[PDB]
Ligand binder design. Structure first.
Ligand SMILES: CCCCCCCCCCCCCCCCCC(=O)OC[C@H](COP(=O)([O-])OCC(O)COP(=O)([O-])OC[C@@H](COC(=O)CCCCCCCCCCCCCCCCC)OC(=O)CCCCCCCCCCCCCCCCC)OC(=O)CCCCCCCCCCCCCCCCC
Ligand code: HEM
Ligand code: HEM
Ligand code: HEM
Ligand code: HEM
Ligand SMILES: CCCCCCCc1cc(O)c2ccccc2[n+]1[O-]
Ligand SMILES: CCCCCCCc1cc(O)c2ccccc2[n+]1[O-]
Ligand code: SF4
Ligand code: SF4
Ligand code: SF4
Ligand code: SF4
Lengths: 216, 289, 216
C-alpha cells in the first residue's frame, strides 16, 4: 500500500476502448442524422450525407470487431453473482454517492456489468439488423418483411445503445478519477478502496502474498 | 440541381458519390469551326452576346482587327487574327476562340467548390454559378485559358455551348448566324465525318497538313476545328499543340489529397496512441511512487 | 530558488502567439475546406464559402506579419548548435519522457527549434505562393505556369504546416505546465529544471549574480 497508484487497465484494453469511442461518435451521430432529419448539421458527420450513408455501416462493423476483443477480455469480470444483489437493492443509495456503505464491489460493480451486457447485446443486435438493411451488398438476399422488421429493430437498438453510452460517460465523469485510469491505466489505492473494495483487496493480497512467497 | 439527371462529372465531388446520371443515353453533340471558310466577320461575337444578354465595354483599337482583345466575363467568344508568311506567301489565319467543352475538363478537375462546374451527358461543360466561390482555380486548370471572372459578382463565366438552346432542340446562336457556314453543329459523330470530308478537300487543294483539331490529351473536345495547317496550330493565334491537363495540376488535385489524408489520419492515430501509451510528461512522475 | 514560478514569456510575445493561433484556426480550416471539399461543414468557417474564399488570404497575411514579429524576438534562441546533437540522437528516449537523462536543454530544445524553422519557412512559402494565386489582386501578373506550380506548392506547404501545428499543440499539451506559461507567462522552477536545465541555470545565475553584484 506504498504507491500512489495501481494499474487497473492494460494499454491494449485502453487503446481499444478509445478506438471504439471515436468510431462510436461518428456512427452514433450519422445514425442520429437519419433518425432525426430535422438535425441537419449531423448529415455532415462524415462530410456529406451521401458519404455518411456509405461509411456508417463500415465504421459500425469496426466497432463490433473491437467490442468482440473487449468481450473476450472483460467478460469473466462482468459475471453476475449473488454478491451483486445488495447493489441492485440500494440503487437509490448508490446514486447518492454512498455505494460503499451499501454493497460489495469487486473489479466492476453491478451497474457496470448490467451496462456491459446491455452494450454487448445491442451491438450484436445492431450487427445482425445492420447487415440485413445494408444496400447495396446484403439487403437483396432478405425477404422484404425481414428487412422492414430489421429497419425497426436497428433504429430502436441504436437509440437504446446511445442512451446507454450517455449514462456510461456520465458515470465515468461522475465517479471522479475514472477517466484517468482509462487514459493512463492507473488508479489510486484509495479510489480502489472506496469504489471497488473487494477488487483492491484481491490485488493487495495477490501482490503482497506472491512477494511474500518469493522469500524476501 | 440535378433536375436533368444526366450529370456525368461534377466538380469537387468524391468519386464514390457520383452525381445523378441515369438519363445518360443521349448522343454527344459538337460544334465544328472550319477556319478555312471563316471570313472573320465577328457575327458569332455579336450573336453570342445578343442571345446571352451580355455586353462588354466599348474598348480601343491598338493596331489590330481583334476586338475585344480577349475573352472576358462579358465576351464568351472572340475572333483571333494572325498574319503570317511562315508557309511561303501571305496568309490571314482567323480563328474563333472560346470554350472547347473538353471531354476531360481541367476547369472541373481543378475546381474546389462542389457543383460549381458540371458536365452533361451530351458533352456540354457548364458553370453552375450559385456554387462558384470566385477562387479562379479553373483559370489555371484549363489548358486553353478560357474561364473569366466577373468583377461585379466574383464568379467565372464562359461559352455554355448555348445549353439553353441545345437542351430544347435548337443549335447555338453563333452556329446559326455564321455567314459562310464556317461553323457547323450536330452530333459529334457526324461533325467528325464532316471534318474528315473537309480535310480531304483541303488536301486536294494543296494543304498537305490539313487536319481536324480534336485533342486526345483532353479526351477530345465538343468544339473542334478544321485547320489548313494542323501541324502548326500555334500559327492560329496560339492554339496549343497537343494540349493536356498540366502535370502540376494533376498531382495537386490527384495523389496529394489521399497522401495528405493518410498523413493526417496516421498522425492523429500516432499522437493519440502515444499519449495513452506513455502518459503525460508532468514535473514529477517519480514522487508518484 | 525561492519563488513558485519564473517568467518564461513576456506579455507581448504571449499576446502575439494567441493572436496567431486564432487567425491560424480560421485560415487552416478554410484552407482545408478547399483541399477536402467532402468536408462541407468547413466551407462555413468564415460564414459562407464565398466569404471564406475572400477572407482566407487576408487572415493569412496577418499571420505572416505576426510570425515575423515572433521571428525577430525568438530567432536568437532557436539557433542550432553542437549541443543539440545529443537530443537528435535520443529522440526515442525523449518521446518516452526521459529527455533530461539524454540531452542538454537550453531555452528551447532541439525539437522546438526544428519546429520553429519549419513553421517559419512554411509561412514564407505560403506567403509567396499565396500572393501568386490570389485573385483578383495579384495572380494576373504571373505567367500561368508559375500560378499552377504555386497552386501545387501552396497546397502542399499548407498541409505540412497544419501537420506541424498538430504536433506542436500535442507537445504543448503533453509537456505539462507549458500552456499556462504561454497564457500567464510563468513557469515553476522545477519545470525549468526538468525540461530546460541549462536555461534555468542561466536565469538563476543571471538572477542571483546581479543581485549579488548590487552588494546586498
Ligand atoms: C493509419 C493510416 C490510415 C490511412 C487511410 C487513408 C485515407 C484516405 C481516403 C481517400 O482519400 O480516399 C479517398 C477516396 C477517393 O476519393 P477521390 O474522389 O479519388 O478524391 C478525393 C477528392 O478529390 C477530394 O478529397 P476528399 O474531399 O474526397 O477527402 C475525403 C475524406 C477527407 O478527410 C480525410 O482525408 C481525413 C480528414 C483530415 C482532417 C484534418 C483536420 C486538420 C485541421 C486542424 C487544424 C488545427 C488548428 C490549429 C488551431 O472525407 C470523407 O471521406 C469522410 C472522412 C471523415 C473523418 C471524420 C473525423 C472526425 C473526428 C472527430 C471525432 O474517397 C473515399 O473513399 C471515402 C474515404 C474514407 C476514409 C475514412
Ligand atoms: C454493428 C454494425 C452496424 C451496421 C452493419 C449498421 C448498418 C446500418 C445501415 C446500413 C443503416 C441505414 C443507413 C445507411 O446505409 O447508412 C443504419 C442506420 C442506423 N444505424 Fe446502424 N449500423 C451498425 C451499427 C450501429 C450503431 C453502433 C449504432 C448506434 C450508435 C447504429 C445506429 C443507427 C441508427 C440510429 C440508424 C438510423 C435509424 C433510422 O434511420 O431511423 N448503427 N445502420
Ligand atoms: C467519452 C466516452 C466514454 C468514456 C468517458 C468512457 C469511460 C470509461 C471508463 C473510465 C471505463 C473504465 C472504468 C473503470 O475502470 O471502472 C470504461 C470502460 C468501458 N467502456 Fe467506456 N467510455 C466511453 C465510451 C464508451 C463506448 C462508446 C463504449 C462502447 C459502446 C464503451 C465501452 C466500454 C466497456 C465495455 C467498458 C468496460 C466495463 C466493464 O467491463 O464492465 N465506452 N469506459
Ligand atoms: C501567408 C499568407 C497566405 C496567403 C496569401 C494565402 C492565400 C491563399 C489563396 C488566395 C488561396 C486560394 C483560395 C482563396 O482565394 O481563398 C489559398 C488556398 C489555401 N491556403 Fe492559403 N494563404 C496564406 C496562408 C495560408 C496558411 C497559413 C495555410 C495553412 C493553414 C494555408 C493553407 C491553404 C490551403 C490548404 C489552401 C487550399 C489548397 C487547395 O485548394 O488544395 N494558406 N491560400
Ligand atoms: C492551440 C494551439 C497552440 C498551442 C497550445 C501552442 C502552445 C505553445 C506553447 C505552450 C508555447 C511555449 C512553449 C515553451 O514555453 O517552451 C508555444 C510557442 C510557440 N508557438 Fe505555439 N501553440 C499553438 C499554436 C501555434 C501556432 C498555430 C503557431 C504558428 C503557426 C505557433 C507558433 C509558436 C512559436 C513560433 C513558438 C515559440 C517556440 C520557439 O521559439 O522555438 N503556435 N506554443
Ligand atoms: C440502474 C442504474 C444503472 C447504473 C449503471 C452503472 C454503470 C456504471 C457505474 C460506474 O460507477 C462506472 C464507473 C466508470 C465507468 C463506467 C461506470 N458505469 O458503467
Ligand atoms: C522528431 C520529433 C520532433 C518533435 C518536435 C518537438 C517540438 C516540441 C517539444 C516540446 O517539449 C514543446 C513544448 C512546448 C511547446 C512546443 C514544443 N515543441 O514544439
Ligand atoms: S461568324 Fe463564322 S465566318 Fe464570321 S467570324 Fe465567326 S466563325 Fe468566322
Ligand atoms: S472560380 Fe468558381 S468555378 Fe472556378 S474553380 Fe473557383 S468555385 Fe470553381
Ligand atoms: S476549354 Fe477550359 S473552360 Fe472549357 S471545358 Fe475545357 S478546361 Fe473547361
Ligand atoms: S455556343 Fe452559344 S454560348 Fe458559345 S460562343 Fe456560341 S453563342 Fe456563345
Amino acid at each position: 500500500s506504498k504507491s500512489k497508484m495501481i494499474v487497473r487497465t492494460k494499454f491494449i484494453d485502453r487503446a481499444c476502448h478509445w478506438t471504439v469511442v471515436i468510431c462510436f461518435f461518428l456512427v452514433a451521430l450519422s445514425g442520429i442524422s437519419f433518425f432525426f432529419p430535422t438535425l441537419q448539421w449531423l448529415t455532415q458527420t462524415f462530410g456529406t450525407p451521401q458519404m455518411g450513408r456509405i461509411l456508417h455501416p463500415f465504421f459500425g462493423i469496426a466497432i463490433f470487431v473491437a467490442l468482440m476483443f473487449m468481450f473476450v477480455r472483460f467478460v469473466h469480470h462482468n459475471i453476475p453473482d449473488k454478491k451483486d444483489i445488495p447493489w441492485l437493492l440500494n440503487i437509490v443509495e448508490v446514486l447518492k454517492g454512498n455505494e460503499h456503505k451499501v454493497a460489495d464491489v469487486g473489479k466492476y460493480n453491478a451497474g457496470q456489468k448490467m451496462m456491459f451486457w446491455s452494450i454487448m447485446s445491442m451491438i450484436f443486435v445492431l450487427l445482425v439488423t445492420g447487415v440485413i438493411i445494408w444496400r447495396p451488398y446484403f439487403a437483396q438476399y432478405f425477404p422484404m418483411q425481414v428487412v422492414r422488421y430489421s429497419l425497426l429493430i436497428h433504429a430502436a437498438a441504436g437509440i437504446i445503445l446511445i442512451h446507454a453510452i450517455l449514462i456510461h460517460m456520465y458515470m465515468a465523469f461522475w465517479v471522479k478519477g475514472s477517466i484517468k485510469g482509462m487514459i493512463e491505466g492507473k488508479v489510486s489505492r484509495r479510489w480502489a478502496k472506496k469504489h471497488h473494495p473487494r477488487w483492491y483487496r484481491e490485488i493487495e493480497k495477490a501482490e503482497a502474498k506472491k512477494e511474500s512467497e518469493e522469500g524476501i | 440541381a440535378m433536375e436533368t439527371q444526366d450529370i456525368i462529372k461534377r466538380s469537387a465531388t468524391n468519386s464514390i458519390t457520383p452525381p445523378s446520371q441515369v438519363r445518360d443515353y443521349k448522343a454527344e453533340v459538337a460544334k465544328l469551326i472550319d477556319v478555312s471558310t471563316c471570313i472573320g466577320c465577328k457575327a458569332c461575337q455579336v450573336a453570342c452576346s445578343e442571345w446571352n444578354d451580355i455586353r462588354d465595354e466599348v474598348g480601343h483599337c491598338v493596331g489590330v482587327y481583334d476586338n475585344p482583345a480577349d475573352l472576358s466575363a462579358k465576351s464568351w467568344t472572340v475572333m483571333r487574327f494572325s498574319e503570317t508568311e511562315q508557309n511561303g506567301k501571305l496568309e490571314w489565319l482567323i480563328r474563333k476562340d472560346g470554350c472547347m467543352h473538353c471531354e476531360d475538363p481541367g476547369c472541373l478537375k481543378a475546381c474546389p467548390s462542389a457543383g460549381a462546374i458540371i458536365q452533361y451527358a451530351n458533352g456540354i461543360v457548364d458553370f453552375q454559378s450559385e456554387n462558384c466561390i470566385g477562387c479562379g482555380y479553373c483559370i489555371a486548370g484549363c489548358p486553353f485559358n478560357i474561364p473569366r471572372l466577373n468583377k461585379e459578382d466574383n464568379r467565372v463565366y464562359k461559352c455554355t455551348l448555348c445549353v439553353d438552346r441545345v437542351s430544347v432542340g435548337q443549335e447555338p446562336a453563333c452556329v446559326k448566324t455564321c455567314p459562310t457556314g464556317a461553323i457547323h453543329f450536330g452530333t459529334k459523330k457526324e461533325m467528325l465525318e464532316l471534318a474528315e470530308q473537309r480535310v480531304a478537300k483541303l488536301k486536294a487543294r494543296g494543304y498537305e497538313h490539313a487536319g481536324v483539331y480534336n485533342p486526345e490529351g483532353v479526351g477530345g473536345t465538343h468544339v473542334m476545328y478544321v485547320l489548313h495547317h494542323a501541324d502548326q496550330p500555334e500559327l492560329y493565334h496560339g492554339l496549343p499543340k497537343d494540349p493536356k491537363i498540366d502535370t502540376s495540376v494533376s498531382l495537386w488535385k490527384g495523389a496529394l489529397k489521399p497522401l495528405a489524408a493518410a498523413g493526417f489520419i496516421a498522425t492523429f492515430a500516432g499522437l493519440i496512441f502515444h499519449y495513452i501509451g506513455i502518459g503525460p510528461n508532468k514535473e514529477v512522475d517519480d514522487d508518484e511512487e
